[PDB]
Design a protein around this ligand. Structure first.
Ligand SMILES: *[C@@H]1O[C@H](CO)[C@@H](O)[C@H](O)[C@H]1NC(C)=O
Ligand SMILES: *[C@@H]1O[C@H](CO)[C@@H](O)[C@H](O)[C@H]1NC(C)=O
Ligand SMILES: *[C@@H]1O[C@H](CO)[C@@H](O)[C@H](O)[C@H]1NC(C)=O
Ligand SMILES: *[C@@H]1O[C@H](CO)[C@@H](O)[C@H](O)[C@H]1NC(C)=O
Lengths: 354, 352
C-alpha cells in the first residue's frame, strides 16, 4: 500500500470539481502508483476573500496538498495563503500580469500567458506593417504598465519608438489626454485598458475624429471585451487568446503536469511534506521551493491546450491569439498568431475608414 | 460621549502600561500564540463580530516579515485601520493594497537607503555594490540608491547590482556562483532576515564575509537586535528602529493615539464616525467612502509629543532611526544616530 499525496484546486463549478477528481485519476491510471499515489481535494471559490483564504487553510492545507490549481476577489487569497507556505499554486485561467511578479506571488504557476504578452504580437505586428512611431496609451496601474514594459523591452532590438501617455484608471473624460495625443500627431495607437476604461477612451476619441481614416487602433483582449464594442472605432484590431477560457481543458493539462511532476519529485532523497494545519506553522514548506523548480523545468507535449512550457516567471512560454478586426458590427478574424509568427486569414484588413 | 473600540493583539509580550479629545477609546488588550494566517485572520475577525472593534494596534516579538503582509490583507478586506507597532508586523511592506488601512511604525525603504548613503557619505565609502533578493522593495531600494548617485558630483562608484533568486531549489550553487562577481568594500544587502542568513553562509564560504569587506543592511535584516545569528558576520552595520529610547508600551500608547485622534478629528468636522465593523464577512462599498476618509486622518496625526504622521504608502514619515553594529561579543551597539536631518555618528575614524 502506497503514499497518498493530495492535489488541491479552487474550482469555478461543482462540475469542474469532478473533471478535476477524474483528471487526477486518469493520471493515477497512466501511473503506476505504487510508492506515491495522487488524491484530489478541491473547493469551490468562496466569493469573500477572507472566507476564501480560510478555506485554503481548513479545506486544503489541512489535507497537506502539494499544489493547488485555481480558476469579489481574484486568486489573491489562494496565493497569499498557500504562497506563505510556498505550496505551488497553478492558475488555470488567470490572465492578470500582477501574478507574474515573483516578489508578490513567488510560488505561482499559470497555464495561460499574462495580458502583457499581447505586446509580443503588437510588436511582431509593427514589424509586419513597418510601424516605427506608435503612441502607447496605458492605464497607470500594474496591468497597464505591465504591458508598457514588455512592449518597450521588445523595442530594444536595434525607447524612442513609442511615446507614452498614461492615465489614471477610472477616469471619465479623456479628451485632455487624447488632445495631447492628437498634438503628438501619430497614426498608430496601442491601448492597454480594461473594458470599462477602454470604453471611455473609445468614446472621447470619437468626439475628436480620432476614430477615422489615417489612424490604426491596436489593442488587447479586455479592450474589446464585452460591452466595449458598442463604442470601438471601426477598423480597430484586437486579440482573443486561443482556448484561454476553458477551465475544463486547463484542469486536464495542469493535473497532467502536476502529476508528471509530483512523481518527478520523489526521485529525490530528503523530501518533506507540506504542513497539515495552517494553525501553528509559520515556516515555509521546505521542499515546496524544489517542487516549484520541478514544475517549471517540466515540459509537456500533446497537452490538450497545446504544448505546456514555462518561462522564467512561470507563465506559459508560448501562446496563440486569434487576431481580430472590427468591421461594421461583425468581428472578423483576419489572422492568427502562432506563438512565434503571425499568419493572416483569407479575409483582408479593413482599416479605420476602409 | 462616543466610544471607539481598539483591539491590541500583542504576540508574546509579558509587559503592561492621558487624552482630552472628543471620542474616548474603549481599549481591549489581547495576546495570541500563533503568527500563522488562519491564526492571525481568525483572531481579528472575532474581536469584531463579538466586541465591536474599530481599529487595531498589533505588535509581536518576531522576525516574521509575512505578518505585515497578512495584516495588510486583513485590513484592505475589512476596511479597518490596523497599526503594526513592533516585530515582523512592522517590517516595511513595500507596496500595500490600494484599499488598505494598514500603517507600520518604521522608515520607508527609501528612507533607510538614504540613511545608508549618508553613512558612506561620512567616511567616503564611495565604491560599493548593491545586492538584493526578490523581496518586495528590491527595485525601490536599488533605484533609490542609483538615483541619488547619477546626479552627484561626488565620486560614487557602483560596481555591481546582484539580484538573487531565492524561490528556486538552490541545488545548483548559482547563488554561490553569482556572489563570485562581488568584490567591493561596501556591499549593500536588501533581503529578509531569514533570507539574510543564507546569503552570509555562502559569503563566509566565498571569503567575502572575511575582513576587508563591509556589509550594510536595513532594519528587517537586523530585526530583533537580541537575536544575532551564527551565520551573521561580525560587523554587519544596519539601520534599526530605535527601541532604545522608544519602548514597546510607549508605542502601543501612540498606536492608541493615532487611531483615536483620527476618529476625533473626523467627528469634529464631519460630525460622525465609522459604525463599528459589522462582520469580517460583511463587506460593502457602503464602507468604501467612510474608510477612504478616515485614512486621511490616520495619516496626519500629532500627539502630546511629536509628529506621528505616515505616508499614503504605509511607512512612517519621521521615525526613530538608529544605526547599529555587531561587535566581537555578538552584540548590537548603537554606533550612530539619525537626527531628523543629519546623522551623528560615534566614531570619527571607523574602528580599525
Ligand atoms: C470633456 O472636457 C472638455 C473640457 O474639459 C469639454 O469641452 C468636453 O465637452 C468634455 N466631454 C464630455 C463628454 O463631457
Ligand atoms: C472546452 O473544453 C471542453 C471540455 O469540457 C471541450 O469539450 C470543448 O471542445 C472545449 N472548447 C473549446 C472551444 O476548445
Ligand atoms: C540528503 O540528506 C543526507 C542525510 O540524510 C545527506 O547525506 C545528503 O548529503 C543530502 N543530500 C543533499 C543533496 O544534500
Ligand atoms: C499634515 O498634512 C499637511 C498637508 O495637508 C502637511 O504639510 C503637514 O506637514 C502634516 N502635519 C503633520 C503634523 O503631520
Amino acid at each position: 500500500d502506497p503514499k497518498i499525496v493530495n492535489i488541491g484546486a479552487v474550482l469555478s463549478t461543482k462540475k469542474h470539481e469532478q473533471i478535476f477528481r477524474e483528471a487526477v485519476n486518469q493520471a493515477n491510471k497512466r501511473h503506476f502508483t505504487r510508492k506515491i499515489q495522487l488524491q484530489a481535494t478541491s473547493v469551490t471559490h468562496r466569493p469573500n476573500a477572507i472566507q476564501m483564504a480560510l478555506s485554503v487553510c481548513e479545506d486544503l492545507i489541512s489535507s497537506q496538498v502539494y499544489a493547488i490549481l485555481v480558476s469579489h476577489l481574484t486568486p489573491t487569497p489562494i496565493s497569499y495563503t498557500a504562497g506563505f507556505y510556498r505550496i505551488p499554486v497553478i492558475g488555470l485561467t488567470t490572465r492578470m500580469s500582477i501574478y507574474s511578479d515573483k516578489s508578490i506571488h513567488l510560488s505561482f504557476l499559470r497555464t495561460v500567458p499574462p495580458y502583457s504578452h499581447q505586446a509580443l504580437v503588437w510588436f511582431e505586428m509593427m514589424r509586419l506593417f513597418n510601424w516605427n512611431h506608435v503612441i502607447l496609451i496605458v492605464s497607470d496601474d500594474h496591468e497597464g504598465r505591465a504591458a508598457q514594459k514588455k512592449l518597450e523591452t521588445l523595442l530594444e532590438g536595434k525607447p524612442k519608438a513609442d511615446k507614452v501617455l498614461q492615465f489614471e484608471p477610472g477616469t471619465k473624460n479623456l479628451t485632455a489626454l487624447l488632445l495631447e495625443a492628437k498634438e503628438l500627431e501619430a497614426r498608430v495607437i496601442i491601448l492597454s485598458a480594461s473594458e470599462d476604461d477602454a470604453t471611455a477612451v473609445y468614446k472621447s476619441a470619437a468626439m475628436l475624429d480620432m476614430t477615422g481614416a489615417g489612424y490604426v487602433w491596436l489593442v488587447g483582449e479586455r479592450e474589446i471585451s464585452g460591452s466595449a464594442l458598442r463604442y470601438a472605432p471601426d477598423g480597430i484590431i484586437g486579440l482573443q487568446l486561443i482556448n484561454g477560457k476553458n477551465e475544463s481543458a486547463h484542469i486536464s493539462d495542469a493535473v497532467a503536469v502536476v502529476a508528471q511532476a509530483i512523481h518527478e519529485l520523489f526521485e529525490m532523497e530528503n523530501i518533506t511534506d507540506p504542513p497539515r494545519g495552517c494553525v501553528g506553522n509559520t515556516n515555509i514548506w521546505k521542499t515546496g521551493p524544489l517542487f516549484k523548480r520541478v514544475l517549471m523545468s517540466s515540459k509537456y507535449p500533446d497537452g490538450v491546450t497545446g504544448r505546456i512550457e514555462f518561462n522564467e516567471d512561470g507563465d506559459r512560454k508560448f501562446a496563440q491569439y486569434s487576431i481580430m478586426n472590427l468591421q461594421n458590427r461583425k468581428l472578423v478574424q483576419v489572422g492568427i498568431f502562432n506563438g512565434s509568427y503571425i499568419i493572416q486569414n483569407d479575409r483582408k484588413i479593413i482599416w479605420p475608414g476602409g | 460621549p462616543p466610544s471607539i473600540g481598539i483591539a491590541v493583539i500583542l504576540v508574546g509580550t509579558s509587559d503592561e502600561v492621558f487624552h482630552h479629545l472628543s471620542v474616548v477609546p474603549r481599549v481591549e488588550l489581547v495576546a495570541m500564540n500563533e503568527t500563522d494566517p488562519k491564526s492571525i485572520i481568525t483572531r481579528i475577525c472575532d474581536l469584531m463580530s463579538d466586541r465591536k472593534i474599530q481599529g487595531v494596534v498589533f505588535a509581536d516579538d518576531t522576525d516574521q516579515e509575512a505578518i505585515a503582509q497578512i495584516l495588510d490583507f486583513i485590513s484592505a478586506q475589512t476596511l479597518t485601520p490596523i497599526l503594526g507597532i513592533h516585530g515582523g508586523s512592522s517590517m516595511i511592506m513595500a507596496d500595500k493594497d490600494e484599499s488598505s488601512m494598514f500603517f507600520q511604525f518604521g522608515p520607508s525603504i527609501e528612507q533607510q537607503a538614504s540613511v545608508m548613503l549618508n553613512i558612506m557619505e561620512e567616511y567616503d565609502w564611495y565604491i560599493f555594490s548593491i545586492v538584493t533578493t526578490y523581496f518586495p522593495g528590491y527595485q525601490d531600494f536599488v533605484n533609490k540608491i542609483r538615483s541619488t548617485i547619477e546626479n552627484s558630483f561626488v565620486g560614487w562608484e557602483l560596481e555591481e547590482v546582484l539580484l538573487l533568486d531565492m524561490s528556486l531549489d538552490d541545488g545548483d550553487s548559482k547563488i554561490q556562483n553569482q556572489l563570485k562577481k562581488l568584490q567591493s568594500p561596501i556591499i549593500l544587502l536588501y533581503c529578509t532576515k531569514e533570507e539574510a542568513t543564507y546569503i552570509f553562509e555562502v559569503a563566509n564560504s566565498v571569503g567575502l564575509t572575511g575582513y576587508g569587506y563591509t556589509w550594510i543592511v536595513p532594519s528587517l535584516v537586523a530585526g530583533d537586535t537580541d537575536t544575532v545569528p551564527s551565520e551573521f558576520p561580525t560587523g554587519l552595520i544596519s539601520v534599526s528602529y530605535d527601541e532604545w529610547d522608544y519602548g514597546l508600551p510607549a508605542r502601543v500608547r501612540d498606536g492608541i493615539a493615532i487611531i483615536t485622534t483620527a476618529a476625533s478629528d473626523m467627528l469634529s468636522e464631519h460630525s460622525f464616525i465609522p459604525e463599528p465593523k459589522s462582520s469580517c464577512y460583511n463587506t460593502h462599498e457602503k464602507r468604501i467612502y467612510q474608510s477612504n476618509m478616515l485614512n486621511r486622518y490616520l495619516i496626519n496625526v500629532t500627539f502630546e509629543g511629536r509628529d506621528l504622521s505616515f505616508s499614503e504608502d504605509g511607512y512612517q514619515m519621521h521615525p526613530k532611526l538608529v544605526i547599529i553594529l555587531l561587535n566581537k561579543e555578538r552584540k548590537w551597539e548603537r554606533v550612530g544616530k539619525w537626527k531628523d536631518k543629519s546623522l551623528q555618528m560615534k566614531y570619527y575614524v571607523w574602528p580599525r
